[PDB]
Structure 1
């Protein structure tokens, strides 16, 4: 009756806030906005890597399989954080407490289309009243369900998927008796997340090719393990 332990565990494993810290000495521009976002993402990747070790069974995978899951899922995980932070806002994306993008800024950054897609995810989760418990569980499921082409132990990854799916099912059965299909509805949000991540990875890859925006080692590694 006191709810699911895996969900409780993921809640306490939740990383602290990360600040974007756009350089206050640099003139606003698309380059500044993109540089800021890519730097924030690089720092987020470090946090995500440390966070995944808390997911039951994740650290028992081969390092290769751990890396493969992370390389496929990192942008989904990043986007779901932006989405969750943005739930109490209207038509704005909280990339960080110090970096909230409205429509104007998205246009300036050349991110209007991508940010509108992320706002589509926000709209859906607002309607469903997405809870923190559900957000953290979905991040874990997106990691485990990321469909990497390169998995060594397919059955172990399948087992990780099942443990987290069970946690979602159990949590919903206990907390949301009014909707016996809420777990499934949650899983049904994952395609739009996958779609949006693919849009983001393609976009930032184009930016990587244009060569005008500085990018760090880890972010580049993740971007280049491509899709």
Structure 2
């Protein structure tokens, strides 16, 4: 039985499985919109996030929501080979992402998946990395930079304490995958901002607003 309070809380507030059911790009747009809603309540549950000013909470979420969603797609895809689990009931391979109308995203996402697979990411490490991505936002709009940093440091410390007990140290290997996570998120955002401009796929207001926000 572990002992890290932050890790336990993060495990507890993890959202439940996502199902695309029970048109390609349209389904993904709807799914992502629902994922954003889940990400917002999830963030509010993080000890340290809700103590941030309301404006900073928005600034952080507008800049990192896609990284959180992308890490979620990667985590769900870990047990698969050359496949992407956008939802439990919605899996696609590189060639599948093609037809669906995702372009190169299939390949970008898989690079991330393979990077995490190489590490053999454990549940504890995943929730910590996800929270870490949220707290590592570099949005110029954040006003209380120190408070965000305090949150990041608390999560960083929890990761070190966790590794120090279970699982070129381990913590650093996990942290070295964050640049790719952000770059991958940037590609997914660009693509969907494109889907928005082409005006052929229906998209919900929240998703549209967040796409415009993380685009600034």
Fold match (TM-score > 0.5): yes
Number of matched pairs: 215
> 5+ residue gaps in structure 2?
none
Aligned 1:82-97 pairs, distance under 5 A: 82-97=73-88
Q: Are positions 1:36 and 2:27 aligned together? A: yes
Q: Are positions 1:174 and 2:165 aligned together? A: yes
Please give the alpha-carbon distance, in whole angstroms, between the structure 2 residues aligned to 1:15 and 1:175: 24
Please give the alpha-carbon distance, in whole angstroms, between the structure 1 residues aligned to 2:18 and 2:99: 23
2:192 to 186, 189, 204: 204
2:110 to 119, 122, 131: 119
1:55 to 31, 34, 46: 46
8 A Cα contact 2:67 2:185, kept in partner: yes
8 A Cα contact 2:60 2:134, kept in partner: yes
Partner of 1:18, secondary structure, is: coil
Please give the alpha-carbon distance, in whole angstroms, between the structure 1 residues aligned to 2:164 and 2:63: 30
Question: Which digits, 9 at most, give the CA deviation of each residue in 1:6-47, with x for residues without a partner?
Answer: 11110011111121128xxxxxxxxx2111001001001111
Q: TM-score, normalised by structure 1?
A: 0.91
Which structure 1 residue ranges, 4+ long, deviate > 3 Å from structure 2? Answer: none
2:172 corresponds to: 184
Question: Which digits, 9 at most, give the CA deviation of each residue in 1:126-169, with x for residues without a partner?
Answer: 11100111111111011111211101111111111111111111
2:11 corresponds to: 11
Q: Cα 1:109–1:169, aligned 2, differ >3 Å: closer, same or farther?
A: same
CA shift for structure 1 position 112: 4.1
1:222 to 200, 207, 210: 210
Please give the alpha-carbon distance, in whole angstroms, between the structure 1 residues aligned to 2:195 and 2:34: 19
Please give the alpha-carbon distance, in whole angstroms, between the structure 2 residues aligned to 1:197 and 1:16: 22
Please give the alpha-carbon distance, in whole angstroms, between the structure 1 residues aligned to 2:123 and 2:2: 16
Q: CA RMSD in A?
A: 1.4
1:25 corresponds to: none
8 A Cα contact 1:7 1:133, kept in partner: yes
> 5+ residue gaps in structure 1?
23-31
Q: TM-score, normalised by structure 2?
A: 0.96
1:108 corresponds to: 99
8 A Cα contact 1:3 1:175, kept in partner: no
1:81 corresponds to: 72
Please give the alpha-carbon distance, in whole angstroms, between the structure 2 residues aligned to 1:105 and 1:175: 37
1:157 to 142, 148, 159: 148
Please give the alpha-carbon distance, in whole angstroms, between the structure 1 residues aligned to 2:9 and 2:90: 29
2:128 corresponds to: 137
Please give the alpha-carbon distance, in whole angstroms, between the structure 2 residues aligned to 1:58 and 1:192: 24
